[model samples]
Target chain A: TDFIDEEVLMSLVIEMGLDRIKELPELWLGQNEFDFMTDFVCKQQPSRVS
Target chain B: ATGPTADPEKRKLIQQQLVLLLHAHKCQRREQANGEVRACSLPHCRTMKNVLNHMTHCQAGKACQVAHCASSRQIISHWKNCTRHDCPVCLPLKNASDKR
Candidate 1:
C-alpha cells in the first residue's frame, strides 16, 4: 500500500522539488505539482508522517 | 530511567520504533557524519505533543541535544527525538554532509 497519504505526500513532493527541480507530470495531484512520479520507485508506499 | 539512564534493552526497542517510524513514512535515513544539516520532506509531527509522545513511548526512549538545537527545525541527536533521520534537526549542520 502507498504508505504516505496522497495529500500529505503532495506537500512533501512540492517541498523537495519546489521550483528548482523538474516536476514529473504523472504524479501531479492537481495544484500539488507532484506530477513526476516515475522518479520515486522505492517510494511506492508513502505513509503518514504522524 | 528513559532519559539518559534507561535500560539498554529498552533503548534498543526505542531504536526499533524509530526505524518503524521511517518505514511508516516511506523515508530512509541518509548518514550524516559531519556537522551537516539534512533536509526532509516530511513535516514535523502534528505538533510538539506528538514529538514528545513518540519520545516518551519509544522503547529506549529519545534524547535531546541539550548542547545544541540539533539544527534549526527541532531537537535531535536521537532517533526518538529524530522526526526522521533525514530531519535537518537530526542531520549535520551543512546540507551536503561532506560532499558525498
Candidate 2:
C-alpha cells in the first residue's frame, strides 16, 4: 500500500533540513556509504528534563 | 509556516527528491512484509519478477529472453544498490553487493 502523505513529506522536508532530505534517496540507493538516519538522530542532542 | 521553502527551484528539487525517497520507502515496506510468497515493491521490481516468472513457466524465445534479462538486470541493479550501513534490511544486502 502506498502511504506517502504529502503533508508529512512536506513537514519532514522542512524539519529534517533540505540537505538531509536530499541525501535520503542516495542513502536508499546505498551510494552515501553511511546510515543517514543514524547520523541524523545522533546529531540531535536531546534536552534533559529535570 | 507558509511553506517548506520560499525559493521555487529549491521547492521543486525537494519534491523530486521526496518522490524517490517515498518509492524507496515503499520498497522497504514490501520487503518487511515478506512471507510464503515473495513480492516486489516498485514497478520495476514487479516487471522484472513477472518476466522471470514467465520465462520459468514457458520456453521464451531467445530474443525475448535476452530483452527480459536486460530489463531484469537493470531493475536488480537499482534495487540492489542499497548501502544504508545501519539499516537492518539494507545492511546485509549492501554487504553482499560489496563482496560481489
Candidate 3:
C-alpha cells in the first residue's frame, strides 16, 4: 500500500520489538488523499482496503 | 482572539474549519454484536453511534437520520465536544433581543 510501509514496518514490529517502539511518537497511517476520499465516503462504506 | 474588530460570525466559521480539519484522516465504522450497534475507533467520542441512538432513538443496527450527522461517525466526531461558543449545535445563540 502506498499509504503504508507494510514490509519495513512489519520488520520493525517483528524484529525491533513492539515494547521499544513505544519510545517513538504515535503512528497514524493515512492516505495522501484521505480528505478527498471522504467526499464520496458518506452514508456508505468507503472503498475496500488494499 | 478578541480584537476590537473580531466578528463573532467570522470566528465561528473559522472554528468549524479547524474542527473539521482535525478529522481529516478519521472514518466511521459499524459493529454489530449481541444486537448492539456502536461507532468504533473514532477519536475522543469513540462512542458516537450509541450516543446518537440515545439522543435520537435511531434504533439499533441502523443508520441515524440526524441531518447534521446521519450516523456518519466522521461527522459526529467532527462536531462532538465542539468548543465554539457560537456553535449552533453545541451552544446556540438565542439573541431574541437583537431585533436588528
Candidate 4:
C-alpha cells in the first residue's frame, strides 16, 4: 500500500494556505476530488450574519 | 488571512477533512490484491471512503442533509462485493458460499 503520512499531508496543505489551494491546477484533482475540496473550503469560511 | 494561524476554527475544520481524505487515500491504495493488504480488512474505513466518494457526485442539495441519497444503494452493493473475509457484511456471504 502507498504510505503517505497523515500528519505530513496535513502540514503541507496547511502551509500551502487557502490562496495556494485555490490556485492548485485543476489537473491535480479529479472532478469529484475538486468538488469535495471546494465544499470543504466553503464550509471552513467564517459565517456571515447579514 | 485564511491560513491556519489566522483562525483556530478553520484549522480544526481543515484537520477534520484532512483525516478523512488521508483515510480514503490509504484505503484506496490498500484495495489492491496484495496478500498483506487483503489480509488486513478494514470494513468501517472502506465504508467511510465509499460515502465520501458518493458525496462528491451527490446532487441532493448544496450539502446532503440525509444519510441516504438516490444512489446510496450502491454503497452496500460495493461493500458486499469487496469479498474481504473479515468484513462483517462480506463474512456472511463468504460463509454461504463455503456451505454450498
User: How much does candidate 4 score in TM-score?
Assistant: 0.32
- For model 2, the superposed segments whose C-alpha errors exceed 4 Å read A1-50, B1-5, B35-100
lDDT string, candidate 2, B8-65, tens digits: 3333433344333433444444545765335532233333334455534544333343
> Model 1 lDDT vs. the true structure?
0.30
Identify the runs in model 4 with alpha carbons over 4 angstroms from their true place.
Answer: A1-50, B1-11, B35-47, B66-100
Better of 3 and 4 by TM-score: 4
Candidate 3 structure lDDT? 0.30
- For model 4, the docking class works out as incorrect
Span of 10 residues, lowest total lDDT, candidate 4 chain B: B91-100
Tally clashing residue pairs in candidate 2. 1
Counting only residues 3 or more apart in sequence or on different chains, how many pairs clash (N, Cα, C under 3 Å) in candidate 3?
0
Candidate 3 chain B least-lDDT 10 residues = B91-100
**Could you tell me the lDDT of residue B51 within candidate 1?**
38
Candidate 1's displacement at residue B93, Å, is 15
lDDT of 2 at B40: 34
Residues B12-94, candidate 1, lDDT per residue (tens digit)?
Answer: 32222232233223332222334443444433322222334444434331233221111111222342444344642233222
Q: How far does residue A23 in candidate 4 sit from its true spot (Å)?
A: 33
Off by over 4 Å in 1: A1-50, B1-4, B27-100
lDDT for each residue of candidate 4 in A1-50, tens digit (9 for 90 to 100): 23345344334434433223221111112223222223334345345853
Ranking by TM-score: 4, 2, 1, 3
TM-score of chain B of 3: 0.22
Report the C-alpha lDDT of model 4 over B1-100, residue by residue, as the tens digit: 4532223443243333333344455566665646466432323334446656676677663344534232232333444456554642334323333221
